[PDB]
């Protein structure tokens, strides 16, 4: 919600409060999403300033407060900063921003990250170029300097972050993306490579000195219809945990497929169908394993731009004898959302 606009500086202070509950059989330890309260809240600001007729500066911050924690010693469990960056923009030359932001490979994956609650299982946080990461310098160009309508591209540099965990660490890397949109149709491709930390290499699962992720997307968005398909392949980038021997690391190779179909009714109701399968290969000790595999049936009723309610059913196809211990039970999300 725009709360300030004076002397060419506008500030959008936005937030939302999501009352959310997960339903799964038993305690949910063997389920896809879990069971219990999942209420959360978001706060952040989006700023944009007109430096002159052509130059434009902007900055953004976004935070996630959890509501399913007590006021005691576990109050901060799950709280985090989602985004925090700043950048500049020149007319048709492009826009350059640095900070914690999304990786370029997300440019493709977003096509299928439209579900009411779940979806986009490949857009892992702090996972190279597929999700929100820290310290990424990103240059983006729209319409190729104003020469082609619908043609956009981006190039990104990922700085090294040697953290205490191999999951949340990364080395230096570069990536890019290309996208074309014409009359509601869209085609996208994105690729990224980066080094791996010593801590990451020392882990039992995964092999190699470089990690690489790439994905491609095709969508149709028009006439109240939304269709999207994503295919991506990753090497030494997807995090995995073997629960039987309690070992962690990365999959040497994964094949990821995402499908989404959605319709938008005039009065608000939005039916949703989706398919998602991520399959790993060359996993040390197992070979091939299924990481994600399900169909989705969900509906979202938009009362208006500020309030919504959704129901999301995940029909889990994972085998009960998964060789990595992946959950095999279904999960039902029920949410009521206020947002501004």
């Amino acid at each position: 919600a725009e709360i300030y606009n004076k002397d060419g500086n506008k500030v959008d202070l936005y937030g939302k409060a999501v009352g959310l509950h997960y339903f799964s059989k038993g305690n949910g330890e063997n389920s896809y999403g879990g069971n219990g309260d999942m209420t959360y809240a978001r706060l952040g600001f989006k700023g944009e300033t007109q430096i002159n007729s052509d130059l434009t500066g902007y900055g953004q911050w976004e935070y996630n407060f959890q509501g399913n924690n007590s006021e005691g010693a576990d109050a901060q469990t799950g709280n985090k900063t989602r985004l925090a960056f700043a950048g500049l923009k020149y007319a048709d030359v492009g826009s350059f921003d640095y900070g914690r932001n999304y990786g370029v490979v997300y440019d493709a994956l977003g096509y299928t990250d439209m579900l009411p609650e779940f979806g986009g299982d490949t857009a892992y946080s702090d996972d190279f170029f597929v999700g929100r990461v820290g310290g990424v310098a990103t240059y983006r160009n729209s319409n190729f300097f104003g020469l082609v309508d619908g043609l956009n591209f981006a190039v990104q540099y990922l700085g090294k972050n040697e953290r205490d965990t191999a999951r949340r660490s990364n080395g230096d890397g570069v990536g890019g993306s290309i996208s074309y949109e014409y009359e509601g149709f869209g085609i996208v491709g994105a690729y990224g490579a980066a080094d791996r930390t010593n801590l990451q290499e020392a882990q039992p699962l995964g092999n190699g000195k470089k990690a690489e992720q790439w994905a491609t997307g095709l969508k149709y968005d028009a006439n109240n219809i939304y269709l999207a398909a994503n295919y991506g392949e990753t090497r030494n980038a997807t995090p995995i945990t073997n629960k039987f021997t309690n070992t962690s690391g990365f999959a040497n190779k994964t094949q990821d497929v995402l499908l989404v179909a959605q319709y938008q009714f005039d009065f608000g109701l939005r039916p949703s169908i989706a398919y998602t399968k991520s399959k790993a290969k060359d996993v040390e000790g197992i070979g091939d394993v299924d990481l994600v595999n399900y169909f989705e049936v969900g509906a979202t009723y938009y009362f208006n731009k500020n309030m919504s309610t959704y129901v999301d059913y995940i029909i889990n196809q994972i085998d009960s004898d998964n060789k990595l211990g992946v959950g095999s039970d279904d999960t039902v999300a029920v949410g009521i959302v206020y947002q501004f």
Binding site: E48, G94, T112, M114, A123, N141, N152
Partner: peptide, 14 residues
């Protein structure tokens, strides 16, 4: 982590 891909785009909105 669903619904975030709704309006992601290359470039800076204005």
């Amino acid at each position: 982590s669903g619904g975030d891909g709704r309006g992601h785009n290359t470039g800076a909105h204005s």
